[PDB]
Write an enzyme that holds these catalytic residues in place. Structure first.
Site, PDB file in Angstrom:
ATOM      1  N   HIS A   1       0.818  -1.236   0.000  1.00  0.00           N
ATOM      2  CA  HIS A   1       0.000   0.000   0.000  1.00  0.00           C
ATOM      3  C   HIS A   1       0.847   1.280   0.000  1.00  0.00           C
ATOM      4  O   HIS A   1       0.263   2.374   0.172  1.00  0.00           O
ATOM      5  CB  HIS A   1      -0.928   0.051   1.226  1.00  0.00           C
ATOM      6  CG  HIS A   1      -1.741  -1.188   1.472  1.00  0.00           C
ATOM      7  ND1 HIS A   1      -3.020  -1.330   0.993  1.00  0.00           N
ATOM      8  CD2 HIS A   1      -1.503  -2.284   2.228  1.00  0.00           C
ATOM      9  CE1 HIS A   1      -3.537  -2.452   1.426  1.00  0.00           C
ATOM     10  NE2 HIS A   1      -2.597  -3.102   2.129  1.00  0.00           N
TER      11      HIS A   1
ATOM     12  N   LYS B   1      -8.809  13.315   4.748  1.00  0.00           N
ATOM     13  CA  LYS B   1      -7.825  12.219   4.719  1.00  0.00           C
ATOM     14  C   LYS B   1      -6.821  12.531   5.830  1.00  0.00           C
ATOM     15  O   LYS B   1      -6.777  13.693   6.285  1.00  0.00           O
ATOM     16  CB  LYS B   1      -7.115  12.134   3.357  1.00  0.00           C
ATOM     17  CG  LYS B   1      -6.531  13.462   2.899  1.00  0.00           C
ATOM     18  CD  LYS B   1      -5.943  13.492   1.473  1.00  0.00           C
ATOM     19  CE  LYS B   1      -6.998  13.470   0.373  1.00  0.00           C
ATOM     20  NZ  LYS B   1      -6.949  12.167  -0.349  1.00  0.00           N
ATOM     21  N   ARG B   2      -6.029  11.533   6.206  1.00  0.00           N
ATOM     22  CA  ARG B   2      -4.991  11.684   7.244  1.00  0.00           C
ATOM     23  C   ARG B   2      -4.071  12.856   6.865  1.00  0.00           C
ATOM     24  O   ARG B   2      -3.804  13.072   5.662  1.00  0.00           O
ATOM     25  CB  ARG B   2      -4.275  10.351   7.454  1.00  0.00           C
ATOM     26  CG  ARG B   2      -5.137   9.335   8.194  1.00  0.00           C
ATOM     27  CD  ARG B   2      -5.547   9.777   9.571  1.00  0.00           C
ATOM     28  NE  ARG B   2      -4.374   9.896  10.418  1.00  0.00           N
ATOM     29  CZ  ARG B   2      -3.943   8.959  11.257  1.00  0.00           C
ATOM     30  NH1 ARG B   2      -4.612   7.822  11.406  1.00  0.00           N
ATOM     31  NH2 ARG B   2      -2.838   9.179  11.966  1.00  0.00           N
TER      32      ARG B   2
ATOM     33  N   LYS C   1       0.350  14.047   1.070  1.00  0.00           N
ATOM     34  CA  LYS C   1      -1.053  14.288   0.610  1.00  0.00           C
ATOM     35  C   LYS C   1      -1.230  15.796   0.342  1.00  0.00           C
ATOM     36  O   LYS C   1      -2.217  16.189  -0.331  1.00  0.00           O
ATOM     37  CB  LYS C   1      -2.060  13.737   1.629  1.00  0.00           C
ATOM     38  CG  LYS C   1      -2.106  12.230   1.810  1.00  0.00           C
ATOM     39  CD  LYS C   1      -2.918  11.771   3.025  1.00  0.00           C
ATOM     40  CE  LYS C   1      -3.074  10.256   3.201  1.00  0.00           C
ATOM     41  NZ  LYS C   1      -3.736   9.667   2.001  1.00  0.00           N
TER      42      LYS C   1
ATOM     43  N   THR D   1      -8.763   5.895  -1.690  1.00  0.00           N
ATOM     44  CA  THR D   1     -10.156   5.379  -1.769  1.00  0.00           C
ATOM     45  C   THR D   1     -11.147   6.500  -1.514  1.00  0.00           C
ATOM     46  O   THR D   1     -12.289   6.379  -2.012  1.00  0.00           O
ATOM     47  CB  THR D   1     -10.403   4.180  -0.858  1.00  0.00           C
ATOM     48  OG1 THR D   1     -10.014   4.613   0.441  1.00  0.00           O
ATOM     49  CG2 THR D   1      -9.675   2.947  -1.322  1.00  0.00           C
TER      50      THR D   1
ATOM     51  N   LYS E   1     -14.960   7.489  -3.267  1.00  0.00           N
ATOM     52  CA  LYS E   1     -16.181   7.858  -2.517  1.00  0.00           C
ATOM     53  C   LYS E   1     -16.750   9.159  -3.085  1.00  0.00           C
ATOM     54  O   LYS E   1     -17.956   9.217  -3.327  1.00  0.00           O
ATOM     55  CB  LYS E   1     -15.829   7.978  -1.032  1.00  0.00           C
ATOM     56  CG  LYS E   1     -15.250   6.725  -0.392  1.00  0.00           C
ATOM     57  CD  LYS E   1     -14.743   6.949   1.026  1.00  0.00           C
ATOM     58  CE  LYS E   1     -13.731   5.916   1.454  1.00  0.00           C
ATOM     59  NZ  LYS E   1     -13.193   6.226   2.775  1.00  0.00           N
TER      60      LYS E   1
END
Ligand code: KDH
Ligand code: KDH
Ligand code: GLC
Ligand code: GLC
Lengths: 815, 815
Positions: free
Chosen positions: B356, B547-548, B553, B655, B659
């Site tokens: 991952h 998200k985290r 990111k 993911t 969504k």
């Protein structure tokens, strides 16, 4: 067995009731256990039956609590660090009249209900007598229709499971919740904060307790059913939980365990004070959470606190919850803003204290430094209580300065301590002992000064045992032959057992009393074979001493007697003696070195006696492992002789004595605790009383106890001490028992040798009567028939009328 | 609302079903909660509904497991340290077709079911994407009729609850079990031993692992229902329990907490390896207990181990359960006595590994000293695996000594480590990435050597999300307008959403897609007011990055854009701009200093932007507190713009991207992870793709990333960095953000400035399309319509056919 289903005292197997029970059994097996009969174990079947039986409590539980809200009677709060409840399945079925219907329902499902009962763990949340007293009391208060609440701690680990390895006690965690507890209801919504440490700041409205560490108290409520009166009361046990808000993040989550350790384990001391800070935290935890409930309930009734003692009784089971007194003052003064004097008037009228021992090492004396750190506001309040209390002593007894020093809540010394018994007496309107002789010893010795200041405070409440658990549950055979003669009212009116004196010459009753004892002995004998591969002679007299291992209870005096019997057989092998199975059981506290040596000596005596081919089946000595409430229910109904041999003046009451009397054993004992009143009820002619009286023990204390005198004058005693010393009972380790011998010869506070000769002669009288079965049985009838005083219903009816100011009632709620 | 009861996708309110639900609701309220409606809280009503709904799983749960015993299909074991399950009540009602019947039943009882749903705690047993993937996968494996078992740890405390205080993250324990978990079934009867420490003794039958410390693994089983196929699979989560047998007795009881700490709390690291011994214990705990179940189940089927890989798949979710490989060898060799080579053949055919991330700091590299102490037999087995594996490398690539060093399971250095990814590749028949670009990057970079040795092992499995939780549950309005056109089959066949491209010009569908988004925005806007007194403009574009918090990111790139919008408004106040509500949410790992600084910067930007009267309602910046599965279900359906802006090559899949696409937001993103395949499915014309591609990032890495160049060439960027540096966003603490500025200017591994200009221009294109509601909506239709690939049913059907060797089935079991 189809025989036990015929027992009328176990109620009716109604056809619709049996149908409904099987349906609900199957329902719980599917929806609750998520099993089918392909994978179901006896444990799944026990749980399916427990959920099915527990469902029958719920309507009555809700309606009882609603009834108390509606009627607003005075509420009784029974505060204890111990609730020795034992199992719950059978007790529930007995109290709801479901026992034959469940037996039939399980039988129709292909199941033995008795085998299912043996799966349940005991709620072993106590050490011994005081813990079991709390349990009998909840049962009696529900049977007497009192709005009564047991309050305690939900220990994750109860009294340790005792294993015997190499003839030594080993302790293992009592993981009683491993498979869950189907009786309790978790109440996380009613969780309350308890404060520790911090500091006091005295300001504009007065004192404020600040900078505290919070531990949450999460209540778990257990139903307490009365006997067939549709009353279901509550036992609320607090569980420790870390507060919601706070080494790093991970360590902080793990460090929640420290606060949660407060409810982790029961301190396994019986009649011994261990001044551990963790124990003090447990004591404050129960008191603080409990008193919050009490205050909230009071305010939500039909703030003015003048009525509080008309609406609240707090009963302190020993000094363990003594902090209730300063906590109630702290709440009324600091939070409710009452004047000190009004708060004090309320506190003393609310609170009452029960004492259970005169042994100085059993009494709680907390270091002031520990109270100052953990509970600074409580220490300030205690000092204020002490000043005003000692002011009253000074005004009653002007210039009696020694009385002031003796009565002070503060004990001077290297370490200044608070005497928690003195705090309880000062802060209570009633103080009771637990047997007539004990309550007299309190007024004459330990509390004489307090008795002189306030004589009206001192009471007696002789202990009792519930005739539900301790006759109907454990000995249905005896309950049945009694009901066949006098009906069922005795089950909640035990004084009706006096009617059995009409049967001392009744051939059928004499036959039936002996047949029930024999049935109990055959069953217990089977158990010892099946669960431990131990063989016992069922034609032997079952001589039983079961209770915590303590020097004052003198298991060692029993040991000397057993070795006397062994040595007498070896000297005159051809001489007939009444065969005996001598059973001793009980737990030693883990730190108690002498107690642990005494267990090893019992097993060591066994190792010799039980393998001597000259003795064979004439004498066997067995240490009953893991003595606890469930094992008490098995061995006591099988017993012939009840050993109650405490040094006169040391056993406050005893309750095991009462269990044995109710179940058809004869008693060998000293004139100590409730043994005195048991002998008085039955007639001394029907008891094997021996040894020094309290007055005789004192005369020895006055001249000094010289054990050597007994050793020098008693050849049979000398022979035994020489066997212990020389290694006869420890050949691989000849000096193993040197500490027992040294204690007996030089440091024996309990005067074991001083009762040796009278004890052995008394035991000969027991053997002489056992040789005459008919006269043994007639004397048993005279004991069962007079056991009625020793009902905890009698005890609680006295607490209710003489201390709590509430009138008990045996009248039933509706259905 | 009577409107939501009309939603056909929510099923039928059968009159008898509604009657039965109300009866069972009332039944649980009385017998299970022991309450009446006089004292019942919304929490009691939630629990009464949860028990009532859970009862509907039980028959299917028992029959499914019985079906698998009978049919003996190959069993899939999905091993993960994380199961990010979220709530369970709504998911259960959706999958059993009970949702309208429960809504009607509760409505008739005077209750709002939606209000009851908000009481349930999320099972937050994961960090983010990998945890949620495990959850979507259990749902898809049940919907596809696979005999699949999720295996993990029952953490007492899940991912920490995030509070924002003073604009800073604060962490609090996720006490998700405070009020119990009505879904799980405790299985203490199936408790298994797990061994730690000890030593290896090599003897007459070979190796023996001895002198170990035991920790028990107590399983808790949770039902996993398939979508209306009557399949109910199992998630088994292990809880740590002290062994039955053992500072003194009290300390020994308290010290049970040390073993029990293994399941206490989830390590809150997302895409970051923390080499804590406690984490290693958690990893071994799951593997050892799980593999015991697997071996026992195998032996109890229709010992010879040749068939074991025909009966068992083990899927490793990351390297977290990598010890499964040496554990299975240890069991087969040491306990089952298979030859090493046969055991190895079995292990590799049983096991497969999912990767991952390519980020080096996220990969597990355990010190050999720690493995040698904790798991001595595992280290010996790993070394043996490494020798035989490197022997194969040497034979494939003779004299390639650098390849041997690169491929070794053993990493040399100051601290010798085991590379757990290398162990997984060696011990697995399949290795997959989680998006096409990621699986190509594995074969080209990190695992190139392994790909060259065994190309057949390397696969792609592009991630997906369950269209049950992530459309039918969270967005019933959208699920309904879709079903009104194409029926209900798409709910388990999401590729049927392609039928919606027929509606790009359909006036009614265009109206309805926009009306559903508006309804979601009005509801979310209400929530922010009701639960946090936060006002948001519902006529604004909802710009969401959830998200985290991670540098890769690039929440910071979003921060630069937000400040650009603020500065452009201040420079030209009269110029119209599309109003925006910019929402950022996510948790930082407690140790991650930069992550925690980034949260403070977001709230700091808010403090200026949200109080500037020149800006007013034209721009608002809100930090969404405590982002978790339940909040994802609220905000994602309300979103206009999905922020997916990871540095190209860093996000393996994503993911949250999927969504958003499924719920009618348009995507602004890099060509990274599954964003590439989402753009391919929809057409790039229907995505706001910007920034460097992987090839461009590499060209910068080749010449060296100089952030100063961007600062020197971009006046708007310079202005923002000068605002951060000078204290414009921290006037009381001007140097507050110096660490962010220093990282951006000198140590930025993620090249934030290099995408700044393309990002701002791309965001202008987003605003331009939003000004045209009709064309915004038509592009949304083109996104929803092509979201079908991103169903986790598609993903799992590929795992089943290409790795596990089992054929999925959508066919229903009976009733
Ligand atoms: O040893 C037998 O029971 C054990 C001893 C015992 C007792 O002394 C008094 C009492 O109130 C209950 C009691 O339950 C014990 C017991 C243990 C079990 O493991 C069990 O399955 C059971 O049904 C019961 C036994 C043997 C028997 O042969 C028998 O028929 C029987 O009903 C019981
Ligand atoms: O803010 C409202 O709900 C919250 C936000 C929200 C959402 O965004 C999406 C979603 O799937 C569910 C959802 O539940 C939230 C909610 C919170 C509660 O405390 C609550 O009691 C409730 O019924 C619900 C709200 C306001 C309303 O005025 C309203 O009529 C309504 O049905 C709901
Ligand atoms: O009062 C209940 C019991 O408390 C303590 O266990 C006493 O030692 C015992 O004599 C008494 O019967
Ligand atoms: O594979 C599931 C998820 O695992 C990790 O969270 C990755 O960072 C994410 O990109 C991926 O989508």
């Amino acid at each position: 067995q189809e025989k036990r289903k015929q027992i009328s005292v176990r109620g009716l197997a109604g056809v619709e009731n049996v149908t409904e029970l099987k349906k609900n059994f199957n329902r719980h097996l599917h929806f609750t256990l998520v099993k089918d009969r392909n994978v179901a174990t006896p444990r799944d079947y026990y749980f399916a039956l427990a959920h099915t039986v527990r469902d029958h409590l719920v309507g009555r539980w809700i309606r009882t609590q609603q009834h108390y809200y509606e009627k607003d009677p005075k509420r009784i709060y029974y505060l204890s660090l111990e609730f020795y409840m034992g199992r719950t399945l059978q007790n529930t079925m007995v109290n709801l009249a479901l026992e034959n219907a469940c037996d039939e329902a399980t039988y129709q499902l292909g199941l033995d209900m008795e085998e299912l009962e043996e799966i349940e763990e005991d709620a072993g949340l106590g050490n011994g007598g005081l813990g079991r007293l709390a349990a009998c009391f909840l049962d009696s208060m529900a049977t007497l229709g009192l709005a009564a609440y047991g309050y305690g701690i939900r220990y994750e680990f109860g009294i340790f499971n005792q294993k015997i390895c190499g003839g030594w006690q080993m302790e293992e965690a009592d993981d009683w919740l491993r498979y869950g507890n189907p009786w309790e209801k978790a109440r996380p919504e009613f969780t309350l904060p308890v404060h520790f440490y911090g500091r006091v700041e005295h300001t504009s409205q007065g004192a404020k307790w600040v900078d505290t560490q919070v531990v949450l108290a999460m209540p778990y409520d257990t139903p307490v059913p009365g006997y067939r009166n549709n009353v279901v009361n509550t036992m609320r046990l607090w569980s420790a939980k870390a507060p919601n808000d706070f080494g790093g993040y991970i360590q902080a989550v793990l460090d929640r365990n420290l606060a949660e350790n407060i409810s982790r384990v029961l301190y396994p001391n019986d009649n011994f004070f261990e001044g551990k800070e963790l124990r003090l935290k447990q004591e404050y935890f129960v008191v603080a959470a409990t008193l919050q409930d009490i205050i909230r309930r009071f305010k939500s009734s039909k703030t003015n606190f003048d009525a509080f003692p008309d609406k609240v009784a707090i009963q302190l089971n020993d000094t363990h919850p003594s902090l209730a007194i300063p906590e109630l003052m702290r709440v009324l003064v600091d939070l409710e803003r009452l004047d000190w004097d009004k708060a004090w008037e309320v506190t003393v009228k609310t609170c009452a204290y029960t004492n259970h021992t005169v042994i100085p090492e059993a009494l709680e004396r907390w270091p002031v430094h520990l109270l100052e750190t953990l509970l600074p506001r409580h220490l300030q309040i205690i000092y204020e209580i002490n000043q005003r209390f000692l002011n009253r002593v000074a005004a009653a007894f002007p210039g009696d300065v020694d009385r002031l020093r003796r009565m002070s809540l503060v004990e001077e010394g290297a370490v200044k301590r608070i005497n928690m018994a003195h705090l309880c007496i000062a802060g209570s309107h009633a103080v009771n002992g637990v047997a007539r002789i004990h309550s007299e010893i309190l007024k004459k010795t330990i509390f004489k000064d307090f008795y002189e200041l306030e004589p009206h405070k001192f009471q007696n409440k002789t202990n009792g045992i519930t005739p539900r658990r301790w006759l109907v549950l454990c000995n249905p055979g005896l309950a049945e032959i009694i009901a066949e003669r006098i009906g069922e009212e005795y089950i909640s009116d035990l004084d009706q057992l006096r009617k059995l004196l009409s049967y001392v010459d009744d051939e059928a009753f004499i036959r039936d009393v002996a047949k029930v004892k024999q049935e109990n002995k055959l069953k217990f004998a089977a158990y010892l074979e099946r669960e431990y591969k131990v063989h016992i002679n069922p034609n032997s007299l079952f001589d039983v001493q079961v209770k915590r291992i303590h020097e004052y209870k003198r298991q060692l005096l029993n040991c000397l007697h057993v070795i006397t019997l062994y040595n007498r057989i070896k000297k005159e092998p051809n001489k007939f003696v009444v065969p005996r199975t001598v059973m001793i059981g009980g737990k030693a506290a883990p730190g108690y070195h002498m107690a642990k040596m005494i267990i090893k000596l019992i097993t060591a005596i066994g190792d010799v006696v039980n393998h001597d081919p000259v003795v064979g089946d004439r004498l066997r000595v067995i240490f009953l492992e893991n003595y606890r409430v469930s094992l008490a229910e098995k061995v006591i109904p099988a017993a012939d002789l009840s050993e109650q041999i405490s040094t006169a003046g040391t056993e406050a009451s005893g309750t095991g004595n009462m269990k044995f009397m109710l179940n058809g054993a004869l008693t060998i004992g000293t004139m100590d605790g409730a043994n005195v009143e048991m002998a008085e009820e039955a007639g001394e002619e029907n008891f094997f009383i021996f040894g020094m009286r309290v007055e005789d023990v004192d005369r020895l204390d006055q001249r000094g106890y010289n054990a050597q005198e007994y050793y020098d004058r008693i050849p049979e005693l000398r022979q035994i001490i020489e066997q212990l010393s020389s290694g006869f009972f420890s050949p691989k380790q000849p000096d193993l028992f040197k500490d027992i011998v040294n204690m007996l010869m030089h440091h024996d506070r309990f005067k074991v040798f001083a009762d040796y000769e009278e004890y052995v002669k008394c035991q000969e009288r027991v053997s002489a009567l056992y040789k005459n079965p008919r006269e043994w049985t007639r004397m048993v009838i005279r004991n069962i028939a007079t056991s009625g005083k020793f009902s905890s219903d009698r005890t609680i009816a006295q607490y209710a009328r003489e201390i709590w100011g509430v009138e008990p009632s045996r009248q039933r709620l509706p259905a």
